[model samples]
Target chain A: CGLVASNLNLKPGECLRVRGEVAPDAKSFVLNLGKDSNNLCLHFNPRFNAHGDANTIVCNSKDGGAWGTEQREAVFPFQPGSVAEVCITFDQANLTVKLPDGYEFKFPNRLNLEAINYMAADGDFKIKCVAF
Target chain B: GLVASNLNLKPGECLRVRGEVAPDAKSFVLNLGKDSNNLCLHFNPRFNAHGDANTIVCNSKDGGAWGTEQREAVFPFQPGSVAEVCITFDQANLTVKLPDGYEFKFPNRLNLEAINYMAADGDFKIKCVAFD
Candidate 1:
């Protein structure tokens, strides 16, 4: 999986904004925040069923190589070859994900860590811009 | 059926209208102007008025005389559902975002610098109307 990582720190009230276009043949993509590839505080994956799994937006966390329970949101607004913007705001209790087309949902911050020092995006989509 | 308003709308501003379309609705109108007689823009979604349930009609009326009608074939609304719609007014165009993230643009035929009157008429209940 291709990846783009940033060292900028993120905390409560800070928003991570991602702008990109889904590849014409894209099947899925992911955006997450944490220290490294192995430990993820927020794993946001949007699947288009390119794999065997069903179409869903899955949110999860990883600690010490162990994955937590995945929270899935069934509302999908992504279209192949179309540009999309995703904004995720961090709160004390949950992460509010604002998807394309004005749809929003919340995922529990299961880790409940105080701060995230890095961010990364990996998948089949092309990144246009990433702003914090 | 008509909801009157003194909303001061200007170029670069956006208006949000959230509501539910009647299950048996045939059409609805979002009108902007000085009054019913001096309409600057008539945003009409006709479910069956234009031979099908997918035509969107846009026009204007100056002094109670209607201008040429512009129709869009791209329809994103369904009957008996709630939708959060946003309309942004540019100097030369009126951009509308349908509930499902589909967007279309129309020419500003009335050429009014500002609109102070607004109304919603037909078969729908307004949940909220906001300008920003």
Candidate 2:
């Protein structure tokens, strides 16, 4: 998140791959693709502890600085302090994500932009690297 | 040859390709490029090239001129089997991974540091190409 928007210049039919390690005492992390800080096309958040539910992945988007409805998936295969690989792919209508353990989820491309030029990661994670 | 273009790849980004090697295939190539005249990488896995089934050739094409080929002796994919190939481009290196856990690194020799187009040649059908 501190890195601001990374100039990935990712477009539809392309994919982004992230390889990194979660913090030992990690709580959650977010991976975002958007036009900038305020407008996100895909907000992928993995929460280790979500209120009463532990290990959930929440998906959403932000439009004009407003957040959209959150979509949650209960499966979580992430281990703190362990390396993980996540892949995000986009097509004409949806953003599909493959979690570290090969579980996948999808969210609608609400923004529906032809391309997402910005990327950012925040929360309790140490990124080994991010690739587009 | 099957080619997918307009990738707009950035440094530190990886291209994840999931596909199968045709049962009758002899060889295949994956190219990272700005265009045909300028390829940052040419990754070829040859089954019968130079009498070596484990031969891997890496080279670059710049300004319509091909560079000297660099060879590695490792082939991990079996014909007719589905596999995952991950190619990561860093500033000075290119890292490749095979589904069999074999990995290799090559020097980045293309004049341009970033590539935005990708082309696949020979008997392979891409299931998906995603980024993390």
Candidate 3:
């Protein structure tokens, strides 16, 4: 019932790896970089209860920074505690997020790079990242 | 509008990147892998029509792969048609997508990592990548 903590320092041009488990009953969770307020968000809304939701897959980015507006999407079946990998890339213009299945979602933002940031979760989960 | 195509690809541990512009009039746009029917969409509600709504930044990835689960978010600033960078690396668990700002949304996928794709836009846009 408390806040989650970690030592992961996110930087510019670096990909973060999050590892966790999702509870089937959890309504929804959030990822925020706000140490206080003033923050933005990218969301994943699973078509819950959908028939045959693939086990392990990859999600990609869109044109610019529109979450839903994706160019390609991939789904890969995965085990509960198995290790999976996802990716996102920044190009001074938009943030193109890549999925394992070979799709993407692109978003845009303008701020200084080299900022050390962190991440957190609420609902069903557990995850981690290794710099590549 | 012409569909922007490329030979670049997205992998399991790579970050796909996109860089582009935002037309003040475009209602919305979509980036799909093959068809438009079976696709995902992430909506960006511009907190604008008034003053400054936080310029350019970097986006981050998060928990497992629930599109909107995070521990941190970062937004980096950049110029129009410039070379900026966002990142998403596969860590064997979750796919973290970092947009311009300090924010992330993880959406899990189960599939083989070998997809090269394209991204088109109506107003704003950017280039995407799949790599470390």
Tell me each candidate's TM-score: 0.48, 0.50, 0.32
Can you write out model 2's per-residue Cα lDDT over B1-132, one digit (the tens) per residue?
335444545677777877768898788888877887888788888876657675778898988999888887677877887877888887788788876678988777774566666777776656556655
Residues B1-132 of candidate 3 have per-residue lDDT tens digits of 113222222444443445454534222232322122221222232223224243221122222222332222333433244322333323222333434444453332323132223234344443332344
Runs of candidate 2 with Cα error greater than 4 angstroms are A50-52, B1-132
Compare the candidates by DockQ and give the number of the best one: 2
lDDT of each: 0.73, 0.74, 0.34
Calculate DockQ per candidate and list them: 0.01, 0.03, 0.02
Q: Distance (Å) between predicted and true CA of B57, model 1?
A: 61
Q: What's model 3's TM-score?
A: 0.32
* Native-to-model Cα distance after best TM-score fit, residue B127 in candidate 3, in Å: 28
Q: How many residue-pair clashes does candidate 1 contain?
A: 0
Q: Give the TM-score of candidate 2.
A: 0.50
Question: Which candidate gets the maximum TM-score versus the true structure?
Answer: 2
Model 2 chain A is weakest, by summed lDDT over 10 consecutive residues, at: A1-10
What tens digits encode model 3's per-residue C-alpha lDDT throughout A12-78? 5766544444554533333333111133223333322333443322222222333333222343233
A25-72 per-residue lDDT for model 2 (tens digits)? 888887777777688988888888756657888888999999999888
